[PDB]
Coordinates of C-alpha atoms in Angstrom, one line a residue:
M179 CA 0.0 0.0 0.0
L180 CA 2.8 2.4 1.0
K181 CA 4.7 2.3 -2.3
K182 CA 4.7 5.6 -4.2
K183 CA 2.1 6.3 -6.9
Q184 CA -0.4 3.8 -5.2
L185 CA -3.8 4.9 -4.0
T186 CA -5.4 2.1 -2.0
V187 CA -9.1 2.0 -1.1
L188 CA -9.4 0.3 2.2
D189 CA -13.0 -0.7 2.0
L190 CA -13.5 -3.2 4.8
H191 CA -17.1 -3.3 6.0
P192 CA -18.2 -0.9 8.8
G193 CA -16.8 -1.9 12.1
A194 CA -14.2 -4.2 10.6
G195 CA -11.4 -2.4 12.5
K196 CA -9.9 -0.1 9.9
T197 CA -9.2 2.6 12.4
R198 CA -8.2 0.8 15.6
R199 CA -6.5 -2.3 14.0
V200 CA -5.3 -1.5 10.5
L201 CA -4.4 2.2 10.9
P202 CA -1.8 1.6 13.7
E203 CA -0.1 -1.1 11.6
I204 CA 0.0 1.3 8.7
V205 CA 1.5 4.1 10.8
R206 CA 4.2 1.7 12.3
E207 CA 5.2 0.7 8.8
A208 CA 5.3 4.3 7.6
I209 CA 7.5 5.3 10.5
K210 CA 9.8 2.3 9.8
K211 CA 10.1 3.4 6.2
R212 CA 10.6 7.1 7.1
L213 CA 7.5 8.1 5.2
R214 CA 6.3 11.6 6.0
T215 CA 2.6 10.8 6.7
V216 CA -0.6 12.7 7.2
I217 CA -3.7 11.2 8.8
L218 CA -7.0 13.0 8.1
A219 CA -9.9 12.7 10.5
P220 CA -13.4 14.0 9.5
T221 CA -14.1 15.5 12.9
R222 CA -12.4 16.5 16.1
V223 CA -14.4 13.7 17.8
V224 CA -12.8 11.1 15.5
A225 CA -9.4 12.7 15.9
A226 CA -9.6 12.1 19.7
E227 CA -10.6 8.5 19.0
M228 CA -7.5 8.1 16.8
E229 CA -5.2 9.2 19.5
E230 CA -6.5 6.4 21.6
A231 CA -5.9 3.9 18.8
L232 CA -2.5 5.4 18.0
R233 CA -1.5 5.9 21.7
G234 CA 2.3 5.6 22.2
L235 CA 3.1 6.1 18.6
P236 CA 4.9 9.3 17.7
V237 CA 2.0 11.3 16.1
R238 CA 1.9 15.1 16.0
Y239 CA -1.7 16.0 16.7
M240 CA -2.5 19.3 14.9
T241 CA -5.8 19.8 16.6
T242 CA -6.7 21.2 20.1
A243 CA -9.1 18.3 20.5
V244 CA -6.1 16.2 21.6
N245 CA -4.3 17.4 24.8
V246 CA -0.8 15.8 24.5
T247 CA 2.8 17.0 24.8
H248 CA 4.7 16.3 21.6
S249 CA 8.1 14.7 21.1
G250 CA 9.0 17.3 18.4
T251 CA 10.5 14.4 16.4
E252 CA 7.3 13.2 14.9
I253 CA 7.1 12.5 11.1
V254 CA 3.3 11.6 11.2
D255 CA 0.8 14.5 11.3
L256 CA -2.8 14.1 12.3
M257 CA -5.4 16.8 11.5
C258 CA -9.0 17.2 10.3
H259 CA -10.0 17.0 6.7
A260 CA -11.0 20.7 6.7
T261 CA -7.7 21.6 8.3
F262 CA -5.7 20.0 5.6
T263 CA -7.6 21.8 2.8
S264 CA -7.5 25.1 4.8
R265 CA -3.7 25.0 5.2
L266 CA -3.3 24.2 1.5
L267 CA -5.3 27.3 0.6
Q268 CA -3.5 29.6 3.1
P269 CA 0.0 31.1 2.6
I270 CA 1.4 28.3 4.8
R271 CA 3.9 25.6 4.1
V272 CA 2.3 22.2 3.9
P273 CA 4.7 19.3 3.7
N274 CA 4.5 17.1 0.5
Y275 CA 3.5 14.1 2.5
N276 CA 4.8 10.8 1.1
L277 CA 1.8 8.9 2.5
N278 CA -1.7 10.5 2.7
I279 CA -4.2 8.6 4.9
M280 CA -7.8 9.8 4.9
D281 CA -10.1 8.1 7.4
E282 CA -13.9 8.1 6.8
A283 CA -13.0 9.1 3.2
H284 CA -16.6 9.0 2.1
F285 CA -17.2 12.5 3.7
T286 CA -18.8 14.7 1.0
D287 CA -18.3 18.1 2.6
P288 CA -16.5 20.4 0.1
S289 CA -13.1 20.4 2.0
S290 CA -13.1 16.6 2.1
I291 CA -13.8 16.3 -1.6
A292 CA -11.1 18.9 -2.3
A293 CA -8.6 17.0 -0.1
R294 CA -9.3 13.8 -2.0
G295 CA -8.8 15.5 -5.3
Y296 CA -5.5 17.1 -4.3
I297 CA -4.2 13.9 -2.8
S298 CA -5.3 11.7 -5.7
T299 CA -3.6 14.1 -8.1
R300 CA -0.3 13.9 -6.3
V301 CA -0.6 10.1 -6.4
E302 CA -1.4 10.2 -10.1
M303 CA 1.7 12.4 -10.7
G304 CA 3.8 9.7 -9.0
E305 CA 4.7 11.9 -6.0
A306 CA 3.0 10.2 -3.1
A307 CA 1.0 7.2 -1.9
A308 CA -2.6 7.4 -0.5
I309 CA -5.0 5.3 1.5
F310 CA -8.7 6.1 1.6
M311 CA -10.4 4.3 4.5
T312 CA -14.1 3.9 4.0
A313 CA -16.5 1.0 3.6
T314 CA -18.5 3.1 1.1
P315 CA -16.2 4.5 -1.6
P316 CA -17.7 7.0 -4.1
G317 CA -20.2 5.3 -6.4
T318 CA -21.0 2.3 -4.3
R319 CA -24.4 0.7 -5.0
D320 CA -24.7 -1.4 -1.8
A321 CA -26.8 0.1 0.9
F322 CA -26.6 -3.1 3.0
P323 CA -22.9 -4.1 3.5
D324 CA -21.6 -6.7 5.8
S325 CA -21.6 -6.1 9.6
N326 CA -20.0 -7.6 12.7
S327 CA -23.4 -9.1 13.7
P328 CA -26.6 -9.6 11.7
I329 CA -28.9 -6.6 11.2
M330 CA -32.7 -6.7 10.9
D331 CA -33.5 -4.5 7.9
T332 CA -37.1 -3.3 7.7
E333 CA -38.6 -0.9 5.2
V334 CA -41.2 1.1 7.1
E335 CA -42.9 4.5 7.0
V336 CA -40.7 6.9 9.2
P337 CA -42.2 10.1 10.6
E338 CA -40.7 13.3 9.4
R339 CA -43.1 15.4 11.6
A340 CA -44.7 15.2 15.0
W341 CA -47.2 12.3 15.3
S342 CA -50.0 11.3 17.6
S343 CA -50.8 7.8 16.4
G344 CA -49.7 5.2 13.8
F345 CA -46.0 4.9 14.8
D346 CA -46.2 2.9 18.0
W347 CA -43.1 0.9 17.1
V348 CA -41.0 4.0 17.4
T349 CA -41.8 4.7 21.1
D350 CA -42.5 1.1 22.2
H351 CA -38.8 0.3 21.8
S352 CA -36.8 0.0 25.1
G353 CA -33.2 0.2 23.7
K354 CA -31.3 3.2 22.3
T355 CA -32.1 4.6 18.8
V356 CA -30.0 6.7 16.4
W357 CA -32.4 8.6 14.1
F358 CA -31.2 10.2 10.9
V359 CA -33.3 13.1 9.9
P360 CA -33.2 15.3 6.7
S361 CA -32.5 18.6 8.5
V362 CA -31.9 20.3 11.8
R363 CA -35.4 21.8 11.7
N364 CA -37.0 18.4 11.0
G365 CA -35.0 16.9 13.9
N366 CA -36.2 19.7 16.2
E367 CA -39.8 18.8 15.6
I368 CA -39.2 15.0 16.0
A369 CA -37.1 15.6 19.1
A370 CA -39.8 17.8 20.7
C371 CA -42.4 15.1 19.9
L372 CA -40.3 12.4 21.5
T373 CA -39.5 14.4 24.6
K374 CA -43.3 15.1 25.0
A375 CA -43.6 11.3 24.9
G376 CA -41.2 11.0 27.8
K377 CA -38.1 10.2 25.8
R378 CA -34.7 11.8 26.5
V379 CA -33.3 13.1 23.3
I380 CA -29.9 14.4 22.2
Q381 CA -29.6 16.3 18.9
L382 CA -26.5 16.4 16.7
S383 CA -25.7 18.6 13.8
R384 CA -22.5 19.9 12.2
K385 CA -22.2 23.1 14.3
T386 CA -23.0 21.4 17.6
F387 CA -21.4 18.0 17.0
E388 CA -18.4 17.8 19.3
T389 CA -20.1 19.4 22.3
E390 CA -23.3 17.5 21.9
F391 CA -21.7 14.2 21.0
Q392 CA -20.1 14.1 24.5
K393 CA -23.6 14.0 25.9
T394 CA -24.1 10.5 24.3
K395 CA -21.4 9.2 26.7
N396 CA -22.0 11.4 29.8
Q397 CA -25.8 11.1 30.1
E398 CA -28.4 8.5 29.6
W399 CA -30.4 8.9 26.4
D400 CA -33.2 7.1 24.6
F401 CA -32.9 8.8 21.1
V402 CA -30.1 10.6 19.2
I403 CA -31.6 12.8 16.5
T404 CA -28.8 13.6 14.0
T405 CA -28.3 14.9 10.5
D406 CA -26.0 13.1 8.0
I407 CA -22.9 14.3 10.0
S408 CA -23.1 11.1 12.1
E409 CA -22.3 9.1 8.9
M410 CA -18.7 10.1 9.6
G411 CA -17.5 7.5 12.1
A412 CA -19.6 8.7 15.1
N413 CA -20.2 5.6 17.2
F414 CA -23.0 5.0 19.6
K415 CA -24.0 2.2 22.0
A416 CA -27.3 1.7 20.2
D417 CA -29.4 -1.2 19.1
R418 CA -31.6 0.5 16.5
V419 CA -31.1 3.0 13.7
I420 CA -34.2 4.7 12.3
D421 CA -33.4 6.2 8.9
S422 CA -35.6 8.6 7.0
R423 CA -33.3 7.8 4.1
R424 CA -33.7 11.5 3.2
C425 CA -31.3 14.5 3.0
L426 CA -31.2 18.1 1.8
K427 CA -29.3 18.9 -1.4
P428 CA -27.8 22.3 -2.0
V429 CA -28.4 23.2 -5.6
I430 CA -27.0 26.2 -7.6
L431 CA -29.7 27.8 -9.7
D432 CA -28.6 29.5 -12.9
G433 CA -25.3 30.2 -11.2
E434 CA -27.3 32.8 -9.4
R435 CA -28.4 31.4 -6.0
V436 CA -28.1 28.3 -3.8
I437 CA -31.3 26.6 -2.6
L438 CA -31.7 23.6 -0.3
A439 CA -33.6 21.2 -2.5
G440 CA -35.6 18.3 -1.1
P441 CA -35.7 16.4 1.2
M442 CA -34.7 13.7 -1.3
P443 CA -33.2 10.2 -1.1
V444 CA -29.7 9.7 0.3
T445 CA -27.0 7.9 -1.7
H446 CA -26.3 4.2 -1.1
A447 CA -23.1 5.2 0.6
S448 CA -24.9 7.4 3.1
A449 CA -27.6 4.8 3.7
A450 CA -25.0 2.2 4.3
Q451 CA -23.1 4.5 6.7
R452 CA -26.3 5.3 8.6
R453 CA -27.2 1.6 8.9
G454 CA -23.5 1.0 9.8
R455 CA -24.0 2.7 13.1
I456 CA -25.5 -0.6 14.5
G457 CA -24.7 -4.3 14.1
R458 CA -21.1 -3.4 15.2
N459 CA -21.0 -5.7 18.3
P460 CA -20.2 -9.3 17.1
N461 CA -21.7 -10.6 20.4
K462 CA -24.9 -8.5 20.2
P463 CA -26.9 -9.7 17.2
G464 CA -30.4 -8.3 16.7
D465 CA -29.7 -4.6 16.0
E466 CA -32.5 -3.1 13.9
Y467 CA -32.4 -0.9 10.9
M468 CA -35.7 0.8 9.9
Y469 CA -35.5 2.8 6.7
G470 CA -38.2 5.0 5.2
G471 CA -37.3 5.4 1.6
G472 CA -35.1 4.3 -1.3
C473 CA -31.7 5.4 -2.4
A474 CA -30.8 7.6 -5.4
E475 CA -27.5 9.1 -6.6
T476 CA -28.4 12.6 -5.4
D477 CA -24.8 13.6 -5.3
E478 CA -25.0 14.5 -9.0
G479 CA -25.4 18.3 -9.4
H480 CA -24.9 18.5 -5.6
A481 CA -23.3 21.9 -4.9
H482 CA -20.5 20.5 -2.6
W483 CA -18.6 19.1 -5.7
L484 CA -18.9 22.5 -7.4
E485 CA -17.6 24.1 -4.2
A486 CA -14.8 21.5 -4.1
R487 CA -13.7 22.7 -7.5
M488 CA -13.7 26.3 -6.2
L489 CA -11.3 25.2 -3.5
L490 CA -9.0 23.1 -5.7
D491 CA -8.8 25.9 -8.3
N492 CA -7.2 28.1 -5.6
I493 CA -4.7 25.5 -4.2
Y494 CA -1.2 25.6 -5.7
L495 CA -0.1 22.2 -7.0
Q496 CA 2.6 22.9 -9.6
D497 CA 3.0 26.1 -11.6
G498 CA -0.3 26.6 -13.4
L499 CA -1.6 23.0 -13.0
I500 CA -4.8 22.4 -11.0
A501 CA -5.7 19.2 -9.2
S502 CA -8.6 17.3 -10.5
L503 CA -11.3 15.7 -8.4
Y504 CA -10.9 12.1 -7.3
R505 CA -11.8 10.1 -10.4
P506 CA -14.8 8.2 -9.1
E507 CA -16.5 11.4 -8.0
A508 CA -15.3 13.8 -10.7
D509 CA -18.6 13.5 -12.8
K510 CA -20.7 14.8 -10.0
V511 CA -20.3 18.4 -11.2
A512 CA -20.2 20.1 -14.7
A513 CA -17.4 22.5 -14.0
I514 CA -14.6 23.9 -16.2
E515 CA -11.3 23.2 -14.4
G516 CA -9.6 26.4 -13.3
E517 CA -12.7 28.5 -13.9
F518 CA -12.8 29.6 -10.3
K519 CA -9.1 30.5 -10.0
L520 CA -8.7 33.8 -8.2
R521 CA -5.9 36.3 -8.2
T522 CA -3.7 36.6 -5.1
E523 CA -5.7 39.3 -3.2
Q524 CA -9.2 37.9 -4.1
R525 CA -8.1 34.4 -3.1
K526 CA -7.1 35.8 0.3
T527 CA -10.6 37.4 0.7
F528 CA -12.2 34.1 -0.5
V529 CA -10.2 32.2 2.2
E530 CA -11.1 34.7 5.0
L531 CA -14.8 34.7 4.1
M532 CA -14.8 30.9 4.6
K533 CA -12.6 30.8 7.7
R534 CA -13.4 33.9 9.8
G535 CA -16.6 34.7 7.9
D536 CA -17.9 31.1 8.2
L537 CA -19.7 31.5 4.9
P538 CA -20.4 28.6 2.5
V539 CA -17.8 28.1 -0.2
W540 CA -20.1 29.2 -3.0
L541 CA -21.2 32.3 -1.2
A542 CA -17.6 33.3 -0.3
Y543 CA -16.6 32.9 -3.9
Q544 CA -19.3 35.2 -5.2
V545 CA -18.2 38.0 -2.8
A546 CA -14.5 37.6 -3.3
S547 CA -14.7 37.3 -7.1
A548 CA -16.8 40.4 -7.2
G549 CA -13.9 42.4 -5.8
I550 CA -15.4 43.0 -2.4
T551 CA -13.0 43.1 0.6
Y552 CA -13.7 41.0 3.6
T553 CA -15.1 43.7 6.0
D554 CA -17.3 45.3 3.3
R555 CA -20.8 44.1 4.2
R556 CA -22.8 46.4 1.9
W557 CA -23.6 43.4 -0.3
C558 CA -25.6 41.9 2.6
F559 CA -28.4 44.5 2.0
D560 CA -28.4 45.5 -1.7
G561 CA -29.9 42.4 -3.2
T562 CA -33.2 42.0 -5.0
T563 CA -36.4 41.9 -3.0
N564 CA -36.9 38.1 -3.5
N565 CA -33.5 37.7 -1.7
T566 CA -35.0 38.9 1.5
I567 CA -34.2 36.6 4.4
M568 CA -37.2 35.8 6.7
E569 CA -37.1 35.1 10.4
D570 CA -40.4 33.8 11.7
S571 CA -42.4 35.1 8.7
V572 CA -41.1 38.7 9.2
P573 CA -38.1 40.0 7.2
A574 CA -34.9 39.6 9.2
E575 CA -33.4 42.9 10.3
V576 CA -30.0 43.8 11.7
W577 CA -28.2 47.0 12.7
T578 CA -25.5 47.6 10.2
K579 CA -21.9 48.5 11.3
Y580 CA -22.9 52.1 10.5
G581 CA -25.8 52.0 13.1
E582 CA -28.7 51.8 10.6
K583 CA -31.4 49.2 11.0
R584 CA -31.8 47.4 7.6
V585 CA -33.5 44.4 6.1
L586 CA -31.3 41.4 5.5
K587 CA -31.3 41.2 1.7
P588 CA -28.0 39.7 0.4
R589 CA -26.9 40.3 -3.2
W590 CA -26.3 36.5 -3.5
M591 CA -28.8 34.2 -1.7
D592 CA -27.4 31.0 -0.3
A593 CA -30.1 29.1 1.6
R594 CA -27.5 27.6 4.0
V595 CA -27.0 31.0 5.7
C596 CA -30.5 30.7 7.1
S597 CA -31.4 27.0 7.1
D598 CA -32.0 27.1 10.9
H599 CA -32.0 29.6 13.8
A600 CA -28.3 29.2 14.5
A601 CA -27.2 29.7 10.9
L602 CA -29.4 32.8 10.5
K603 CA -28.1 34.2 13.8
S604 CA -24.5 33.7 12.6
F605 CA -25.2 35.4 9.3
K606 CA -27.0 38.3 11.0
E607 CA -23.8 38.9 13.1
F608 CA -21.8 38.7 9.8
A609 CA -24.0 41.3 8.1
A610 CA -23.7 43.5 11.1
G611 CA -19.9 43.4 10.9
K612 CA -19.4 41.5 14.2
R613 CA -16.8 39.2 12.8

């Protein structure tokens, strides 16, 4: 696996021990061969788990999620997917790692897709080796892969709203359930319904993940309500997964705006990863998987792969060359390679709008490529009237940095800046110049 120009897809089934059994052996061999190695964790939660699996090994943990004092002589680096891509984009030296290991390599967030494209390009150039660790590589058609113990798969109507009757099987269960919902707002309504029924519920989403995931270990719970983020190696002591089999898809309309289309079916990979939360204990057969819809390849035209090209077009590889997307997922977007390449100053604005600004990739690109500097927020208010952002059926309002109360009406409308209360709150602060 570790020889140059080789990209290995480590596709053992979920729970087969890729992270805690195979990965330490890979690291030991890479250290023995003096291979400068990077390990890429999807989340800070997974990064902490890796330190436990790699404990004792000389690994430099480039994340505050791991409290360790370093030897200084480490040739293996561990960081999150997003960190790797962020450092590639910034004016910062990133080592040309001889071995690139990405765990949970099915992650479809833009920075993860970009990392896979950059890494696979360096391998294709004969410059490095790569190992992608995931049971569900891009394009897989198997929603029901092998597991450590048998799983009861049942197609069943799954609530996506509050219910009063007709779903007794949901609440009659006595174990612990992980419930994959299409959106934060959908999970809020289901969680409120379950709590009213006397169930203790924990909710997980991307923004709250690390803080809220700790609750699954520190307090007793009946249900975990989570978006698709729990497809990325989050592990629970559950005996049932309820899967709506649905997700939101960001879609760019006319190159003009981003909507959150759906809910619509998940991919086979996501369905397999959602189901893969259970059936993990070889001595505990009988875990249940209830799924409420079919699968489709809804990653085609999905904005994340367009956004991945926006990132890759602004990562230096060699002179004017631009890294291509990882081959199995390169057809998920109709993009002209290099069409999003920005000049030096606009690239820096693009980066800061994503890092400090916390804006979606697509939205940050629109602002930066328009020649707007990072602190210039006038574009948040001079859009067309149909771009008005609403907050409880009244137009959202903020005080501008000039002290004037104005309606939130961004020139470019990205539905992800207001998909829930927390996102809209963060964008209101941005439009007010508070970060």
